[PDB]
Structure 1
């Protein structure tokens, strides 16, 4: 049994109250108050559509993934990663795909900086899409489940689906469950072929063990995974630590 599986069993035993006190203990988060009020009022400039813009921004500002050229955003949802990339000087085009419909978020039209190079398409299940030529491959898909065997399947399916979209490109891919042994096996194989490293984002909640496979980095995957499992187990051992609360991102306005 992996440390992550022990973390998973403990998370599943939590009451709603304990889960709610655990999920943001010691994490980092952006203050969404201003963006939510603006979005409610139909404002189309400055605001990020979701917490995702700040989440991807954390990797980009650390040079872990450097978006350039034609960017593909798989599972774009409302479009947080797509509107963020649209404002980056090296980026020429942003194509976002998302499933939509019941249980899924629809793209939100915005007029933030670089909006004119963005095309978000709903009704697109990536597991049925042929791969396209692109310079940057982004993927934020992976639905949590109380079952880590369900999550193992979902994770391996994402890893296999993204691979042909990967051919010497910049990339940032969510790995929903990186602790299951069969997931580690695939990740090690992918790292030997495409390089990169698994990174834990401080804006991720404690209720998910997600890590992101980014192109610009190196390291031991197993080691990084176990450090996350230890971190998340340690966060059950003490009273809730209020999160670091930061300013949300300003995505500006106008065309590029």
Structure 2
């Protein structure tokens, strides 16, 4: 009944060729060719990003939707694309990434982009049930798509609920994936969070048109219903007139090395484990 649900229904009726043409229509895309070859080759001496997701947080950060600073927590870090990005940032002092890393889930990848020494990963960690800890910057990129819209609704709600559990008084900066933002319960939850914590919701152009995912962020205030509806209408318009062409931009390439705000023995042990 929402435009979002209409979008989702139509998406799953498209032919293969049509779905493929649609999913990239007028989106932005980083070229991952170089990073993929270095990952395959298993190099750790090159400043590449371990995932395509790093482009999302770079956009959010550079645009000013998110300040990344102090003690950064990254919930559902997977390979760690957001964790390594954060670690390379001037005002960041530490990064802690948590992820399941169970069968069929990505495990943290060892890399040596700038600030790798201030990043700690722990897999086999369920962020929904584990103890919380303070953060200045709280990131969560969780929300697994499903053909059942109600499963997506429930998954979105759980992510938002867990964000509120992890948020400390000093957590002034945040970025939380909202997988399916158009469900009335999700809109309501977002509005209730905003009443307490401010912020707003944004569509990242690096998201494919095959997902309606948006991000609840600390660095801008906006009207939740309007932004979500605006995105719904944009995904629908692109569906009526698919260009089949994405805007290609350069990938998240980073310098390498360690930061000052160094115990190489404990670092080696940390890398041995990853």
TM-score (ref. length: structure 1)? 0.98
Name the counterpart of 2:149: 148
| SS of the residue 2:128 aligns to | helix
Name the counterpart of 2:246: 243
Structure 2 Cα separation of the partners of residues 198 and 88 of structure 1 = 23
Residue 67 (structure 1) aligned with residue 68 (structure 2):
yes
Aligned length: 256
Structure 2 Cα separation of the partners of residues 151 and 130 of structure 1 = 25
Structure 2 Cα separation of the partners of residues 84 and 15 of structure 1 = 36
Structure 2 Cα separation of the partners of residues 26 and 68 of structure 1 = 32
Name the counterpart of 2:2: 2
Structure 2 Cα separation of the partners of residues 186 and 250 of structure 1 = 36
Structure 2 Cα separation of the partners of residues 143 and 128 of structure 1 = 17
Residue 118 of structure 1 and its aligned partner are, at CA, apart by 0.3
Asked if structure 2 preserves the Cα contact closer than 8 Å seen for 1:83 and 1:251, the reply is no
Residue 55 of structure 1 and its aligned partner are, at CA, apart by 1.2
Residue 15 of structure 1 and its aligned partner are, at CA, apart by 2.4
**Structure 2: gaps (5+ residues):** 260-274
**Structure 1: gaps (5+ residues):** none
Name the counterpart of 1:102: 103
Residue 115 of structure 1 and its aligned partner are, at CA, apart by 0.3
Alignment of 1:169-188 (within 5 A): 169=171, 170-188=173-191
Residue 168 of structure 1 and its aligned partner are, at CA, apart by 4.3
Structure 2 Cα separation of the partners of residues 18 and 104 of structure 1 = 29
Residue 55 (structure 1) aligned with residue 61 (structure 2):
no
Name the counterpart of 2:164: 163
Structure 2 Cα separation of the partners of residues 137 and 246 of structure 1 = 27
Post-superposition Cα deviations, 1:134-176, rounded to whole Å, max 9, x if no partner, equal 1110000000011111000000011001103223421000000
Residue 252 of structure 1 and its aligned partner are, at CA, apart by 1.4
Name the counterpart of 1:27: 27
Structure 2 Cα separation of the partners of residues 147 and 18 of structure 1 = 21
Residue 196 (structure 1) aligned with residue 199 (structure 2):
yes
Name the counterpart of 1:212: 215
Asked if structure 1 preserves the Cα contact closer than 8 Å seen for 2:135 and 2:170, the reply is no
Residue 49 of structure 1 and its aligned partner are, at CA, apart by 0.3
Residue 72 of structure 1 and its aligned partner are, at CA, apart by 0.4
| SS of the residue 1:235 aligns to | helix
Post-superposition Cα deviations, 1:218-244, rounded to whole Å, max 9, x if no partner, equal 111000000000000011112433100
Name the counterpart of 1:138: 139
Q: CA RMSD in A?
A: 1.0
